[PDB]
Design a protein around this ligand. Structure first.
Ligand SMILES: *[C@@H]1O[C@H](CO)[C@@H](O[C@@H]2O[C@H](CO)[C@@H](O[C@@H]3O[C@H](CO)[C@@H](O)[C@H](O)[C@H]3NC(C)=O)[C@H](O)[C@H]2NC(C)=O)[C@H](O)[C@H]1NC(C)=O
Ligand SMILES: *[C@@H]1O[C@H](CO)[C@@H](O[C@@H]2O[C@H](CO)[C@@H](O[C@@H]3O[C@H](CO)[C@@H](O)[C@H](O)[C@H]3NC(C)=O)[C@H](O)[C@H]2NC(C)=O)[C@H](O)[C@H]1NC(C)=O
Ligand SMILES: Clc1cccc(Cl)c1N=C1NCCN1
Ligand SMILES: Clc1cccc(Cl)c1N=C1NCCN1
Ligand SMILES: [Ca+2]
Ligand SMILES: [Ca+2]
Ligand SMILES: [Ca+2]
Ligand SMILES: [Ca+2]
Ligand SMILES: [Cl-]
Ligand SMILES: [Cl-]
Ligand SMILES: [Cl-]
Ligand SMILES: [Cu+2]
Ligand SMILES: [Cu+2]
Lengths: 623, 623
């Protein structure tokens, strides 16, 4: 319960403490304007490892239970975003601004995530005071307002060309609310500068219509009237109790980061802790296209929220009928705690494949949850094997984002329908794998194979390409940073100080199970924000100053990243320290006809494996 | 059903015809000595494709149903192995020799696989003539027959250092009869020369005792008696009619080659053929060590028989209790047909993960078979997805090979017991994927992603790394032969002539999934026999003269291979021809403590994916 997500009651307490303690008068974030003071979110502040392990292993008292509140200070001479550490629960006595502490300075107010109320005010502007200025061309293309269809908007990110920018390409789509929302692009995109704290000052800085750009909608309308614009017509055996799952072989505390997504703590196999924490850090997406949004889009999904955008799992569909179903509570953009029903599910999965052949079939423990944004869907799986192996997979599915088809559009994807292109994109996800193999003190090994031509002892006149094992202990972080798209040692394992019964260092190896979306060139002005994408796998010294490889604040200002993961790799020693492993997994997705109306989970996904390597003395037991 | 394996009735008739034609001097292969004449095996002769398709598609009469008989002609001045085509079934009248026609000449007698009678005769020699010579050292190390555990022999291959050799290193192991009978290597290996036609003339050419090499066993005993030898004492919807599966979505004819292994013909998703044939071709293993057998062993398992060594599927273990099980029939080293009970199992598996999202469940059809040699176990999987996708998967499991632990043994693996090493080795499998995408005439496309620094259209001063698609039609065989370990197109697919509704070439893409082992250096004078291991993927024109990428006769003479796969690649055009795909999957295996007593199929193994890429005009429907 030192890893348990804040209870609904706990959420209320922090919210009450803020109102009573904070000098500035706060507005409900659900109805907050840019120049208002509001609480964006409050959630569990993860405890220090040292105090947690002291409690977990040495019977010391639990660490002070704390919450981290994100506050939008827009109602002052100089607006800022402030992170407040509140605690200790159940009854708070302090409220510490750790902003400067964690980031070296203040959080620029433009890095703050776009409020829901900000989206709605952007819609008012578009529908009420922008779109009508191009009714003639909209009536023409898309039966606009004339007893015809309803249109809707799509968001994109980041929002500008440099730091300080808050200008978003919003696309116009049909409001067909069936199997596919952004499957009918109108080819009309609007660049709305919404950086100003006064919405009446927001403007459209440029328009994109079906191929070409215009300064504003008034310019587009007259060229249309003047018959100067060509318009394309668009038609249409284990027990969950609290945060703790316990089987005969496994024990772990689970949870959900409102921004970082699904996580698991204190992973113990048969009483022995394998890892302190296995958590999702960030989910990314890079697009390509000849239309603005698809041309520019680079998603750092934690800027939105993997937990905040998690959905209830449908019993029988998302998880087996006899699965265990847990709820989740959150305060993001609200006054009162909200509850997500069936956010998680744990169940037993008979693989149907013989685990060993006298033997028995492969039965697995599965921890699952789903994040959904605009209908796309990430299904996050954590599977725990009876032999001590852990499997972490990601599955993408749902509706793809679309682009209006014009010109050399096929240079950026495939046609999936009339006037519709499926733009290229790569999916990526970052995981923090804080293995504690045989305790804190860890080393890193790189074992692989080699063929060396040597003479045959019984026939020295003949040679034989001798297959043999190479081993190397990595000394610095730099040696253990493995570039995506390159080759890493086939057996890369974190080992303990001690060895097994046979003299081999007790180890758990990480096996990356993911094809290669393929890294963004470091020449990209925003690549630093997702520099975790450079590596297939990286090992660093765990620090309390390095809790995440990304940040909520990166999405809207990637040009100056709040968290630049590459900074973590700094030539420090990794021999005999508390080590963390960061795994990047993903794939290239060139959309195709089969992806319509939905992209299916067909395949076995993308992720990695954690497997015992000289950790036990022989094949372990099982119930 | 012209792809059906020969029935028992057919197997009997061919043997009768073969006995009548081949004089009165034939001998039951089960009891034949090297100088005898016997029928090694009789199995189905795969029909000509043109005639097969003409029958299936154009209603033309079925092509002649034939069998292939391998005959060991050791009874003559110049002994050879002969391949005979026998037909037509059901009542044969001819028996033609296709040996020269297929192999450019005679099959040398030393290439023939080692008969079971030959092995038993080798054991006799070892236990009657050989071991007794070293009774003193065996009593001391291994309680030879002093109330101690019994000894057995372990085979290895190839058998020599050059073409023409039949000299095998047999290892001596305790026969506990519990768990791994191969977990107790004594450190004694005999290099027996069983080349000669007269067993009485067979000799041991060298002996390896626990690290040291000796000329003969007597010398080893002599050396020991003189106290010049240290001895380490060793302790102690769908149904299936005949050969065809018929789900609501799929149709195919399954079978099993006596040597090649499991195979599928006439694969049809919703009535349309995707592939004429998908079959296992060869299974390989490459070891390392400082002990003889372990250092020399390179396997081409079809020399023993993936089918001949197939095992009964344990209901409720290898396949769900209520799956559909099918028997198999064969004649190998027997003049009477044998039955392999429950050789196959076909079943639907609820994937346990939603196909799409509320949404729909994901269930697959699974065709399984298991090959077993000395308790080491290949489980062959081909899963057909409701969306037209096909997953071919291989898992290994069971008892690993052990070696006597001495010297720089850890350079060749890990100690897994007392005086026991787990030698390094790679596993590999070759599959023949004859895709007929939209018909015979097929092309090959290479698709991937790329970034191009381009100015932002709405902000000229700034740049954006523009993600885009690259497409390239491959023209010759050499272009489609991608080296194992290197990087290849993320989107390589065979395409028909027709485009989809949207104008994209209808194709099925080959996504190769493996932690590929690591190719044997081409400097090795024997890797030519398994030159298929060079490429993770290769595409060649289909040829009736290139039915397989390996041969039963490769194993015992890899230095002059009967089939050298790379010969297929000869700069021929692959633009609008009958194309065949060849896929290599494998992995490096450094044995660990968890492999004892036996290694688990944990995770998912190795193989590949066949995915529809613009083959349809939208997501396919299900029934
Ligand atoms: C982001 O904005 C935050 C909220 O405006 C700033 O935090 C506040 O700064 C205030 C002004 O300095 C502090 O007020 C102090 O409180 C005393 C009463 O105790 C007043 O009399 C003083 O005017 C003032 N004292 C001074 C000069 O420090 C608040 O204590 C403080 N509020 C909280 C909750 O921290 C941040 O400074 C700003 N971030 C950055 C880094 O600029
Ligand atoms: C591998 O061995 C095979 C059998 O030992 C050889 O093939 C045999 O050779 C026989 C004698 O040369 C053939 O008999 C000849 O052919 C006709 C056909 O039946 C016979 O009537 C004749 O008696 C004889 N020729 C003449 C004119 O005297 C056998 O037909 C044949 N046996 C079988 C069953 O195939 C192969 O030659 C040898 N491999 C090679 C290619 O060298
Ligand atoms: Cl949430 C999700 C699921 C699958 C693929 C992507 Cl790229 C996703 N990410 C986003 N969707 C729109 C904003 N981010
Ligand atoms: Cl048949 C099999 C199953 C699993 C692994 C290997 Cl290397 C196998 N191959 C051989 N075992 C002994 C002869 N070859
Ligand atoms: Ca660091
Ligand atoms: Ca650690
Ligand atoms: Ca060829
Ligand atoms: Ca073909
Ligand atoms: Cl494992
Ligand atoms: Cl970019
Ligand atoms: Cl697919
Ligand atoms: Cu996608
Ligand atoms: Cu193995």
């Amino acid at each position: 319960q030192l890893f348990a997500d804040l209870s609904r009651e706990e959420l209320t307490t922090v919210m009450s403490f803020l109102t009573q303690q904070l000098g500035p008068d706060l507005v409900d974030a659900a109805q907050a304007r840019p120049s208002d003071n509001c609480v964006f979110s409050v959630e569990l502040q993860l405890p220090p490892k040292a105090a947690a392990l002291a409690h977990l292993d040495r019977g010391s008292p639990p660490p002070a239970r704390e919450a981290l509140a994100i506050v939008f200070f827009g109602g002052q001479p100089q607006p800022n975003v402030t992170e407040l550490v509140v605690g200790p629960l159940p009854q708070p006595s302090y409220m510490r601004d750790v902003t400067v502490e964690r980031h070296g300075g203040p959080l620029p107010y433009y890095r703050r995530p776009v409020l829901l109320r900000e989206y709605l005010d952007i819609d008012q502007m578009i529908f009420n005071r922008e779109l009508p200025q191009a009714a003639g061309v909209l009536h023409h293309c898309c039966s606009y307002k004339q007893g015809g269809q309803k249109l809707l908007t799509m968001n994109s990110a980041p929002r500008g060309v440099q730091s300080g920018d808050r200008s978003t390409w919003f696309g116009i789509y049909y409001n067909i609310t069936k199997g596919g929302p952004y499957l009918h692009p109108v080819g009309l995109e609007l660049l709305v500068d919404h950086k100003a704290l006064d919405p009446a000052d927001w403007t459209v800085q440029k328009v994109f219509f079906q191929g070409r750009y215009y300064e504003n909608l008034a310019q587009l309308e007259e060229q249309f009237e003047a018959g100067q614009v060509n318009v394309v017509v668009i038609p249409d055996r284990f027990s969950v109790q609290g945060n703790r799952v316990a089987s005969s072989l496994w024990t772990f505390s689970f949870g959900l980061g409102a921004f970082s997504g699904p996580r698991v703590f204190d992973v113990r196999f048969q009483g022995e802790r394998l890892a302190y924490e296995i958590s999702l850090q960030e989910a990314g997406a890079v697009y390509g296209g000849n239309t603005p949004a698809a041309m520019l889009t680079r998603y750092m999904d934690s800027g939105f929220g993997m937990g905040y955008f998690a959905t209830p799992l449908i019993r029988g569909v998302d998880c087996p009928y006899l699965a265990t179903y847990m709820d989740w509570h959150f305060v993001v953009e609200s006054q009162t705690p909200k509850t997500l029903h069936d956010a998680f599910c744990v169940f037993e999965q008979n693989k149907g494949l013989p685990l060993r052949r006298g033997g028995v079939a492969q039965t697995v423990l599965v921890f699952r949850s789903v994040s959904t944004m605009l209908n796309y869907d990430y299904v996050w799986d954590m599977v725990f094997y009876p032999n001590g192996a852990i499997e972490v997979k990601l599955h993408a599915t749902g509706y793809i984002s679309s682009a209006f088809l014009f010109g050399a559009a096929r240079r950026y994807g495939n046609q999936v329908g009339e006037h519709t292109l499926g733009p290229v994109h790569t999916h990526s996800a970052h995981y923090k794998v804080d293995l504690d193999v045989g305790g804190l003190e860890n080393w890193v090994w790189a074992e692989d194979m080699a063929f060396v031509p040597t003479a045959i002892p019984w026939s020295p006149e003949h040679q034989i390409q001798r297959l043999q094992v190479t081993r190397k202990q990595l000394e610095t972080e730099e040696q253990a940073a493995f570039p995506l798209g390159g080759a890493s040692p086939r057996y890369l394992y974190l080992a303990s100080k001690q060895s097994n019964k046979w003299g081999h260092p007790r180890g758990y190896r990480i096996q990356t199970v993911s094809f290669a979306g393929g890294p963004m060139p470091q020449n990209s002005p925003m690549e630093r924000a997702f520099s975790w994408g450079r590596y297939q796998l990286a090992i660093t010294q765990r620090k309390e100053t390095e809790p995440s490889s990304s940040s909520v604040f990166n999405q809207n200002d990637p040009w100056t990243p709040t968290v630049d993961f590459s900074d973590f790799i700094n030539n420090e020693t990794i021999a005999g320290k508390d080590l963390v492993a960061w795994v990047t997994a993903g794939f290239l997705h060139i959309p195709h006809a089969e992806d319509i109306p939905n992209t299916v989970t067909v395949g076995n996904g993308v992720g990695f494996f954690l497997r015992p390597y000289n950790f036990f003395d022989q094949e372990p037991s099982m119930d």
